[PDB]
From a paper:
[name] splicing, executed by the spliceosome, proceeds in two sequential steps: branching and exon ligation. Comparative analysis of these three late-stage human spliceosomes reveals the molecular mechanisms of 3′-splice site (3′SS) recognition, exon release and spliceosome disassembly.
The ATPase/helicase [name], which is responsible for the disassembly of the spliceosome, is only present in [name]. The only compositional difference between ILS1 and [name] is [name]. Similar to the S. cerevisiae ILS complex, [name] is bound to the middle portion of the NTC component Syf1. Although the rigid core of the spliceosome remains unchanged between ILS1 and [name], binding by [name] results in marked positional shifts of surrounding components. Comparing to ILS1, the U2 snRNP core (U2-A’, U2-B’’ and the U2 Sm ring) undergoes a translocation in the [name] complex. The U2 snRNP core is displaced by about 30 Å away from Syf1. The helix IIc of U2 snRNA, which binds the RRM domain of CypE in ILS1, is co-translocated with the U2 snRNP core and consequently dissociated from CypE in [name]. The RRM domain of CypE interacts with the intron sequence instead in the [name] complex.
Residue numbers in the entry:
A (entry chain K): 63 to 93, 105 to 169
B (entry chain r): 3 to 133
C (entry chain s): 68 to 134
D (entry chain q): 3 to 134
E (entry chain t): 67 to 133
F (entry chain L): 703 to 752
Write the structure that this text describes.
Amino acid sequence: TDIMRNEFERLAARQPIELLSMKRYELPAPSECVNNSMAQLEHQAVRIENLELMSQHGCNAWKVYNENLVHMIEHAQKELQKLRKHIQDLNWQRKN
Amino acid sequence: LICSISNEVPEHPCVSPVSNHVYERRLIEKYIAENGTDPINNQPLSEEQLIDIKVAHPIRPKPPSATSIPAILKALQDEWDAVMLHSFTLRQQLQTTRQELSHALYQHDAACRVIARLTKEVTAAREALAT
Amino acid sequence: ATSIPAILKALQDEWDAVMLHSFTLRQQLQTTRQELSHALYQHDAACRVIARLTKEVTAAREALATL
Amino acid sequence: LICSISNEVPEHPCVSPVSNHVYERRLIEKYIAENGTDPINNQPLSEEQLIDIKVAHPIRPKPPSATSIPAILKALQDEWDAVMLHSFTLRQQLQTTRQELSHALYQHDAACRVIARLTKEVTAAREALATL
Amino acid sequence: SATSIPAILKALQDEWDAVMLHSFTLRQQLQTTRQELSHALYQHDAACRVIARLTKEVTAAREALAT
Amino acid sequence: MTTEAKRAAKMEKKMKILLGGYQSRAMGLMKQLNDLWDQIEQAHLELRTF
């Protein structure tokens, strides 16, 4: 019950083929390229800016996610116990 | 800690007041517009009925070796591969469960007829000893 | 039409359906597994009724036969 | 990860359904038994209204990572929304340079007519005086 | 459009590829308009030094005409 | 490209050294969570069975 999204998604999975991305930026060639050069400079600047931003977030946050992921994990295994205790009781009852 | 629709770790979790279950806002907002009821309990629920919750925020460490290039090419490609080959394999799992359902119920009803056939057999054999 | 910001908005809107579809597909997945599990357990449970019944029926035969 | 009332790491988290915030069950239970209210917003709340944290249901999740499709899409918003501000830094600075260039080229065009007349007048004064 | 989805992947690739160059071309033009502006400021201040010597040659001429 | 990507590679390798360890740390946690969510359903299913 979805729009166009479902038609191309089901076709991609059925055919077993992922849609090709931009295989351009990595290769390139020395000696149109004035634009391609100016793309690279801006991208590099963003990476430094993103790297600083990423490092800046990673630098202090690098472990913040881990702290949150440990609170998320322990909650599941508490449920595992609560389910374990009910079922055991039921089994015991049946046995008796 | 997770969303009860997609299997996400929500960025803006919101709880419904009819059934205490945390959903990611976008996914619960979509369900209410599709059909105005709670997805789990099938109880009447609206967009105003929801209550947004707050937490210390979730942090993902963007890989150190990251850029516009892998994020456009390699990472996004793997995400639509992993979505495609999983749901196709999940559709394969649902098809076999229904086939293995039919082998279960037939073998069950086959056993019922054996019991019914042996219930007439045993008590009449015991009755014959009484006679 | 061929801009940029709304393409990402469109990408969200189609994903919003993807999540809603995966939910209803999983509900029926697990809700059917409950019927599968309760049946298989109760089947092999009802199967042990026969094993018991067959051996008693058998005991009634040699008893009456030898008498 | 924290309890908002005490500030400890809660060993039994239960989320309220009036002010969305993760409280420790043993702490919030005593707050409700004191008076039927939510500590933050002071809205009415009972013990049955409070709900423990649970595994969603039957859909399996994975932790929040950079791979995950939704986290990757919200990343590309950060990319473009930051690059859009990068364009303002160059659009705003261009409107100062071209505005200073416009007044500079006007002062150049207003001045060079006076250089042309003094080169005329100082040579005309040398043409006049030398002949006499 | 109905547009194939594998193609929509390569569109978003091209559109980011285009915006990266449309941001680059707009920055090197800003640096060269400021650079060519700085070449005008040197000529502006160099010209008003050359007018001071030309005014002296006119002042020297007005003294000789009087004599 | 020279100035920025050299800074990027320095920023990356400085981050990577600190964060590839924290990535591995994070990845494990995520995997564990996923696994748990898998045991949760089997116990709920078996709870409703029993």
